[PDB]
Amino acid sequence: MEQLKCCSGILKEMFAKKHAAYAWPFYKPVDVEALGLHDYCDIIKHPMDMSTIKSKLEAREYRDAQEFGADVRLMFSNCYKYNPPDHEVVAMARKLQDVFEMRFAKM
Ligand SMILES: Cn1cc2c3c(c[nH]c3c1=O)CN(CC1CC1)c1ccc(CS(C)(=O)=O)cc1-2
């Protein structure tokens, strides 16, 4: 699909140096053990991160751009659900979501 190729472009933008200052906590799965977030799995039923989405896209796990978009939004929603609203990581998620929503709207 043409729109799935657009999804590869979306990930390249989200992983780019321009956005690294706020995107970096979303690059890989939340490491509950190293971070001491032992209540994370009690709140978050479906963890998601950018590396997992990249692997799913490459393995043809998304039928269309809407399925890809749902996993990106799941990653943001997990952050908004788990953390207090004033947390530094929530502000970072919002800045990354701005990048994603503007690009996703172009297709
Ligand atoms: C998505 N996310 C991510 C983090 C996180 C934290 C609390 N709540 C979340 C959350 O919701 C603690 N901090 C926040 C960070 C300073 C701004 C870190 C630190 C390192 C990593 C990468 S890792 C591979 O070591 O997990 C992730 C996260």
From Swiss-Prot:
Record-annotated Bromo domain positions: 2-107
Post-translational modification: Phosphorylation by CK2 disrupt the intramolecular binding between the bromo domain 2 and the NPS region and promotes binding between the NPS and the BID regions, leading to activate the protein and promote binding to acetylated histones. In absence of phosphorylation, BRD4 does not localize to p53/TP53 target gene promoters, phosphorylation promoting recruitment to p53/TP53 target promoters.
Localization terms from the record: Nucleus; Chromosome
Marked site: Acetylated histone binding: N83
Tissue: Ubiquitously expressed.
Free-text note regarding domains: The NET domain mediates interaction with a number of chromatin proteins involved in transcription regulation (NSD3, JMJD6, CHD4, GLTSCR1 and ATAD5).
Extra information: JQ1, a thieno-triazolo-1,4-diazepine derivative, and I-BET, a benzodiazepine derivative, have been tested on tumors with success. Treatment with GSK1210151A (I-BET151, a I-BET derivative) has strong effets on mixed lineage leukemia and promotes myeloid differentiation and leukemia stem-cell depletion.
Function: Chromatin reader protein that recognizes and binds acetylated histones and plays a key role in transmission of epigenetic memory across cell divisions and transcription regulation. Remains associated with acetylated chromatin throughout the entire cell cycle and provides epigenetic memory for postmitotic G1 gene transcription by preserving acetylated chromatin status and maintaining high-order chromatin structure. During interphase, plays a key role in regulating the transcription of signal-inducible genes by associating with the P-TEFb complex and recruiting it to promoters.
Family named by the database record: Belongs to the BET family.
Disease entry from the Swiss-Prot or TrEMBL record: Cornelia de Lange syndrome 6: A form of Cornelia de Lange syndrome, a clinically heterogeneous developmental disorder associated with malformations affecting multiple systems. It is characterized by facial dysmorphisms, abnormal hands and feet, growth delay, cognitive retardation, hirsutism, gastroesophageal dysfunction and cardiac, ophthalmologic and genitourinary anomalies. CDLS6 inheritance is autosomal dominant.
Assembly and binders: Interacts with p53/TP53; the interaction is direct. Interacts (via CTD region) with CDK9 and CCNT1, acting as an associated component of P-TEFb complex. Interacts with RELA (when acetylated at 'Lys-310'). Interacts (via NET domain) with NSD3, CHD4, BICRA and ATAD5. The interaction with BICRA bridges BRD4 to the GBAF complex. Interacts (via NET domain) with JMJD6 (via JmjC and N-terminal domains); the interaction is stronger in presence of ssRNA and recruits JMJD6 on distal enhancers. Interacts with NSD3. Interacts with NIPBL.
Protein's name according to its UniProt entry: Bromodomain-containing protein 4
Species annotation: Homo sapiens (Human)
Gene: BRD4
Parent-protein residues present: 352 to 457 of 1362
